[PDB]
Amino acid sequence: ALDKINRYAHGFVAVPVICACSEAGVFELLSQKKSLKLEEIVEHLAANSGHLMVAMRLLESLSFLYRSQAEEYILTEQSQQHQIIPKALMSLYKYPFELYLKGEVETGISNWINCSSRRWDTENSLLSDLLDGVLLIPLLLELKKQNLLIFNTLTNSLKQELSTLFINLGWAEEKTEGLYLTDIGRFMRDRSLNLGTTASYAPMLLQMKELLFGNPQRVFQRNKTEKERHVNRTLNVVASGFQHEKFFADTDKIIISIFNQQPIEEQPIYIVDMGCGDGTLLKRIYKIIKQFSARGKVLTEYPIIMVGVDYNQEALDVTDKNLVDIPHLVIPGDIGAPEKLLEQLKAQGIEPEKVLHIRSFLDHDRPFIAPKNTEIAQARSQLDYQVVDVDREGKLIPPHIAVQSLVEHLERWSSIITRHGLLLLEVHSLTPAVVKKYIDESESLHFDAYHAFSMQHLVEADVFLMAAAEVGLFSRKEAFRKYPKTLPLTRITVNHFEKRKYQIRYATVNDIPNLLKCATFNPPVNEPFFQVLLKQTPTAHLLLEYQGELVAAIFTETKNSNEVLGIREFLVRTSVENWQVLAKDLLEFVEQWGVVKPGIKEIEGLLKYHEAISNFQKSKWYQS
Numbered sequence: 172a173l174d175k176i177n178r179y180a181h182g183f184v185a186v187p188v189i190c191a192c193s194e195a196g197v198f199e200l201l202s203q204k205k206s207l208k209l210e211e212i213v214e215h216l217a218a219n220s221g222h223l224m225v226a227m228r229l230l231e232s233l234s235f236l237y238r239s240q241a242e243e244y245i246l247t248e249q250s251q252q253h254q255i256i257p258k259a260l261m262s263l264y265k266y267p268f269e270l271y272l273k274g275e276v277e278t279g280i281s282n283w284i285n286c287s288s289r290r291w292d293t294e295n296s297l298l299s300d301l302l303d304g305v306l307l308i309p310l311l312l313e314l315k316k317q318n319l320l321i322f323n324t325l326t327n328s329l330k331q332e333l334s335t336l337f338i339n340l341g342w343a344e345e346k347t348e349g350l351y352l353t354d355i356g357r358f359m360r361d362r363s364l365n366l367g368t369t370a371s372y373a374p375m376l377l378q379m380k381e382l383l384f385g386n387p388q389r390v391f392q393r394n395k396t397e398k399e400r401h402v403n404r405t406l407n408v409v410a411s412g413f414q415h416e417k418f419f420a421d422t423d424k425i426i427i428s429i430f431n432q433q434p435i436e437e438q439p440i441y442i443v444d445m446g447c448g449d450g451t452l453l454k455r456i457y458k459i460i461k462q463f464s465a466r467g468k469v470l471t472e473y474p475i476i477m478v479g480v481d482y483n484q485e486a487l488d489v490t491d492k493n494l495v496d497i498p499h500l501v502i503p504g505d506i507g508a509p510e511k512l513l514e515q516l517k518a519q520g521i522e523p524e525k526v527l528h529i530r531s532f533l534d535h536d537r538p539f540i541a542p543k544n545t546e547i548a549q550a551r552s553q554l555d556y557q558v559v560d561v562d563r564e565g566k567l568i569p570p571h572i573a574v575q576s577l578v579e580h581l582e583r584w585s586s587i588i589t590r591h592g593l594l595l596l597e598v599h600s601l602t603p604a605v606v607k608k609y610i611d612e613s614e615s616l617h618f619d620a621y622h623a624f625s626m627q628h629l630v631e632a633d634v635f636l637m638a639a640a641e642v643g644l645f646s647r648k649e650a651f652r653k654y655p656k657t658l659p660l661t662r663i664t665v666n667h668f669e670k671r672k673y674q675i676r677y678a679t680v681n682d683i684p685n686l687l688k689c690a691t692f693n694p695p696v697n698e699p700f701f702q703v704l705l706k707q708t709p710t711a712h713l714l715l716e717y718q719g720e721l722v723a724a725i726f727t728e729t730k731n732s733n734e735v736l737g738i739r740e741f742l743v744r745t746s747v748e749n750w751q752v753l754a755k756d757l758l759e760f761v762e763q764w765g766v767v768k769p770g771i772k773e774i775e776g777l778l779k780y781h782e783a784i785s786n787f788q789k790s791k792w793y794q795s
């Protein structure tokens with residue numbers, strides 16, 4: 172029942188992609204020559220490689236195609252579905268539903284209502300719902316916006332149209348007397364705001380042809396007034412603010428812990444939210460402190476000051492008003508410039524070491540800064556990252572470059588984070604293998620697509636935790652939360668990052684000489700087996716470094732339809748100070764990292780390798 176709303180959102184993004192690919196000859200091209208790499212498709216259709224990569228990943232996730240071992244795209248039988256889509260269906264992204272209701276339009280939507288009644292002339296249930304979403308999303312939102320949700324206030328023609336539609340969808344019934352919204356109907360109305368984020372990108376999605384095959388900057392160029400035209404930003408902010416706020420309550424346990432920590436005088440004074448928006452999160456945190464923490468009993472003697480930072484002056488004004496009766500400060504700032512933030516805070520006389528930094532859902536929407544560490548980026552290019560990211564020319568940014576960009580961005584933040592740490596909520600993309608497997612249960616198909624199309628910078632959850640670990644930021648175990656809770660995929664993380672003295676990164680082939688010399692729980696591993704492990708999973712073996720010195724490393728195996736992660740090797744160097752604590756930290760990180768690893772349902776070996784490091788002398792490690 173709840174899978175219907177998700178499928179509608181899938182269709183809202185997928186139908187523009189499918190129709191644009193169809194009209195351009197993508198499916199014909201992949202028929203005349205059955206195995207093309209991305210760049211051959213780009214070349215022959217004069218496409219934009221970045222947006223096209225977004226479209227191909229979406230098509231792969233819908234099982235319309237797959238990639239060979241050589242990364243060639245091959246169509247499946249499902250791809251024939253593109254012929255079922257009526258190509259005039261794209262007109263609905265431009266149809267004045269506001270005028271249709273109120274009856275000030277020449278042409279109604281009877282044709283589409285009839286299409287939906289016939290399930291769009293296919294027995295593919297998923298496909299029928301994808302097509303429905305193109306119609307039902309704008310219609311349901313306009314019906315909501317005008318408080319029409321019965322139809323006794325519309326003209327008789329309009330009433331019959333929508334009564335037919337609603338009755339065919341199981342949304343309304345009339346047994347005795349008049350109409351009545353069913354449970355499903357009542358639920359679609361009561362959840363319409365969740366569709367508002369996806370719906371707000373209708374202008375961009377209408378121009379999918381331009382993104383894939385034309386000049387993408389025509390979609391995004393802003394006028395003198397600086398209004399965005401790829402998205403209805405005002406509706407977007409309302410809708411996404413409503414969705415983001417659903418995760419603010421997971422900060423409560425973190426805030427309560429922080430402001431229960433004795434002694435009061437050593438707790439934070441300032442709580443600084445980068446990208447504060449309307450200040451909803453700052454307001455919530457202050458109320459939680461006041462009601463539920465030890466700090467809240469002594470604010471008279473030890474005041475808390477809430478600080479809202481935003482690069483938009485109107486947001487500072489709204490936040491200023493929303494934080495009335497709370498001691499607060501509003502200042503300009505940018506997620507990309509923590510060093511300027513620190514400078515402005517010092518200018519205010521704010522003691523930097525007294526700051527708890529916080530933010531929600533902003534790192535992926537930062538202005539992209541290209542990597543400056545060209546050497547470390549090159550090392551990275553051998554790893555098998557699947558991050559899709561698109562530049563202002565519509566060209567694909569190589570995954571390792573997008574990752575290096577995130578690492579350097581977090582490094583700038585890492586250099587200012589205090590003992591109080593960094594409260595950080597973020598949303599994440601998934602891989603197509605996992606999106607394909609959980610298409611009904613997860614939002615990723617449409618959400619990852621419209622994020623990449625609009626040149627935002629999602630990464631998979633494990634990539635994000637790795638990027639943080641590479642710069643010494645570690646998500647504290649007692650604060651951590653991931654969603655969806657019970658599926659083997661992570662779209663949202665709630666983190667309290669603390670700064671530590673060491674870093675964790677992926678082991679590489681270049682580390683094998685150092686690794687060979689470590690003490691090891693299993694008998695000394697030789698080079699070929701290290702090579703086997705690194706080759707089959709280049710981004711699944713973790714190592715902890717301190718002041719350029721290897722301290723410990725954990726190798727893993729991924730098995731059983733890639734559902735099971737298992738600990739495979741445990742290496743340490745016992746000449747490094749505090750090595751045993753550090754090695755236990757690494758094992759704890761591997762568990763957290765494994766929990767958010769796309770597609771992993773369980774982790775094997777934690778008990779066995781925990782005992783090995785905990786009772787080290789009794790476990791008789793080799794080469795110690």
Ligand SMILES: C[S@@+](CC[C@H](N)C(=O)[O-])C[C@H]1O[C@@H](n2cnc3c(N)ncnc32)[C@H](O)[C@@H]1O
Pocket residue numbers: 411412415445446447448449480481482483486504505506507530531532533536537538
């Ligand atoms: C990112 S959404 C709201 C974020 C908010 N923390 C949340 O969880 O919903 C838009 C808000 O973030 C701000 N914002 C967008 N980009 C920013 C940037 N690069 N630096 C600082 N603030 C930014 C916008 O001005 C707007 O107030």
Ligand SMILES: [Mn+2]
Pocket residue numbers: 535536622627
């Ligand atoms: Mn976003």
